[PDB]
């Protein structure tokens, strides 16, 4: 049988494209500067026969083979719009400078799941070269002090940059999905404990004095109202900030004594 591969079916169409001549490419760039829909479309196919050889050199990266071909095409479109016919330079000589920059522009943005700005990727590739160069002259395992010595960088800075290269492996590849748990509480006994504890707090604040309960419900917001500070709650009940603070300690001791005689220990709550 025959498999309709994306790489084989694309390279077969390249053979049906004529070569670009240096005498006609200069005349074609003159028609493209004035403005013509067929001139830019025809000239785009001339420099297209080079994208299959440039992208074939770069391999073993995060992008697939088909992504390097489509990305290289966007480089010649931005390069064919800006051309100098009076300078006499070759159109293909200027196109090979933009496709190389466009390939490296997309090789660092789609290689990792986390989007990283240009300020932090320009340091990982340099450290990747430094980690490969220092490992060749030493022929041993590179340490953290060796990287900070050759690059003349602080020891604390080289540790954070090397930690950004996560390179997360697979999960379903064994499973790992069954062994992992959740950070949030999901135990039925723990959820019932938070229910009985919260219901006892609203019950304890109501069984105490009515005056000692409304001064703490507005400060911390245990009853559900909006929380207030010492100055915000002053204009509500009492402007004397010193008098409303003395009753807070008295209500704090009453809630502590009512908790010890209730059968619950404070040291057993934290455990």
């Amino acid at each position: 049988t025959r498999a309709l591969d994306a790489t084989q079916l694309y390279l077969n169409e390249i053979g049906f494209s004529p070569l670009l001549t240096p005498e006609e490419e200069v005349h074609f760039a003159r028609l493209a500067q004035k403005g013509d829909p067929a001139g830019r479309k025809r000239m785009i196919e001339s420099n297209l026969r080079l994208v299959v050889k440039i992208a074939r050199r770069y391999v073993n990266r995060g992008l697939s083979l088909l992504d390097l071909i489509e990305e290289g095409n966007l480089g010649l479109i931005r390069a064919v719009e800006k051309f100098d016919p009076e300078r006499g330079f070759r159109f293909s000589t200027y196109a090979t400078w933009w496709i190389r920059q466009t390939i490296e522009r997309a090789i660092m943005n789609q290689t990792r799941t986390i989007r990283l700005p240009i300020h932090v990727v320009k340091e990982l590739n340099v450290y990747l070269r430094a980690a490969r160069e220092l490992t060749h002259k030493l022929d041993h395992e590179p340490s953290p002090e060796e990287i900070a010595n050759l690059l003349e960088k602080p020891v604390a800075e080289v540790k954070r940059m090397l930690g950004l290269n996560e390179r997360v492996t697979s999960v379903d590849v064994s499973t790992l999905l069954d062994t992992l748990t959740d950070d949030r509480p999901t135990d039925p006994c723990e959820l019932l404990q938070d229910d009985d504890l919260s219901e006892s707090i609203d019950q304890w604040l109501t069984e105490l004095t009515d005056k000692q309960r409304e001064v703490v419900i507005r400060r911390f917001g245990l009853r559900g109202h909006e929380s207030s500070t010492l100055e915000e709650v002053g204009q509500e009940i009492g402007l004397t900030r010193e008098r409303v603070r003395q009753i807070q300690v008295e209500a704090l001791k009453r809630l502590r004594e009512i908790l010890e005689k209730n059968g619950l220990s404070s040291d057993a709550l934290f455990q």
Partner: peptide, 30 residues
């Protein structure tokens, strides 16, 4: 460290290629 499922890579591959096609509708592609 963290873990990413194999489905997140498949959705990322179809989204970026969709934007490459969504931006090549007015460039007069042959």
């Amino acid at each position: 460290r963290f873990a990413t499922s194999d489905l997140n890579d498949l959705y990322r591959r179809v989204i970026n290629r969709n934007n490459r096609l969504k931006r090549l509708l007015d460039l007069a592609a042959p």
